[PDB]
Amino acid sequence: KTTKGVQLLRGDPKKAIVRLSIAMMIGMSVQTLYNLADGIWVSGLGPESLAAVGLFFPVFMGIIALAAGLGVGTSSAIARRIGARDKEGADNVAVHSLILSLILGVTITITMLPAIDSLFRSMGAKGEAVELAIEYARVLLAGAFIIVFNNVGNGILRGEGDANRAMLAMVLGSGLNIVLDPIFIYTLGFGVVGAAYATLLSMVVTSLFIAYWLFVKRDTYVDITLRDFSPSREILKDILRVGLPSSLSQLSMSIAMFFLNSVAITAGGENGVAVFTSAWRITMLGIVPILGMAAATTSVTGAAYGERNVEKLETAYLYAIKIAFMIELAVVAFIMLFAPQVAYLFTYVIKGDLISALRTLPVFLVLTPFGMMTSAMFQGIGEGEKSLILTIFRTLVMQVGFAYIFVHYTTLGLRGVWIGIVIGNMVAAIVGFLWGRMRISALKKT
């Protein structure tokens, strides 16, 4: 009645942080590799194919945000029950989360399918452009349930500390999508819609593995059955108090990027937006280790909170920050030193401005862990609303705010955008860190 994952969660927090975060970073790196490769295949199909992907992209990211939001709500709620040695509670959360995956996933499909035509056209698309985007979108929308299920499955695994399988499920899915991409797009000649089917099939296979582990081998720590299922308002509210604000955090980010783009356009037009796009994509690569660490932090602080061990929660939180800080130091030094080389490789025009960008913009990555791990621990203790507030403050008030100030009130132009983004992120990192310290001392008094 105990797994390696549960032993890990109930063990030394530093050991748990390292194991989980390495596992998440590996899984997320394969997801990143898939994305880069798919970007390349699609690029060679022409403007009409890119524009079709472009039309669906906000919807698709919205679907990811909802799925991953439910996943982290699930992870946190399970980790806390396990820490509290509430086995029946952990079982019931898992069952609840799986029923929610069906409700959410299918709702996404049935709501968007009849909406996408009007949506794409309202975006300014006409005739053939509309038709191609719909062919592409409907394949992916068909798998909305699968996506949510996979994310919930991953959430359950992370919640009970099973770093190994959570990682494996990510590797299998993105790895299979990497294999199927050139075969569906070019070999079978399906073009852009081929990329959608490669993705749909990859997700289906992932779900088959997860369903096998959960329902056939039944070798997770949590027991999952409908025989023992009694609807719980408290469980539903617990999941959504982390899950909904997590999803909304992605929305805040998306809105922020829109404004950031408009500022880049104001400063540099098509040239400026191109430089920003490239510099941001490269800098977001440095974000990957932080995300893996955040996922670890949520599970580990959750378990500690359930155990009512504030010392343990604080240790995991601060150790996560320290490790992410060190990693980011190396990442930033690397990009800063090798900016011309890095630019050369991602461009194949905008070289000089991109090099400047790569030697200013990535600086904020060094302070990101202080805010992001705080957000992850807020989620671990179940207070997702605080994580959302911090996310809004960083992305919309600080990032966009300062970027706007430097461009409208100074003569820095493009460089002012990078500087504003850096300054904004760093202020938010300090505020978030201070809030986390305050929250923790409050815990010690409670």
Ligand SMILES: CCCCCCCC/C=C\CCCCCCCC(=O)OC[C@H](O)CO
């Ligand atoms: C454009 C070029 C793109 C190149 C694309 C390369 C794709 C590499 C994919 C996976 C390897 C990454 C390392 C994966 C390590 C996984 C370790 C693991 O999952 O362990 C399972 C566990 O041991 C169960 O017993």
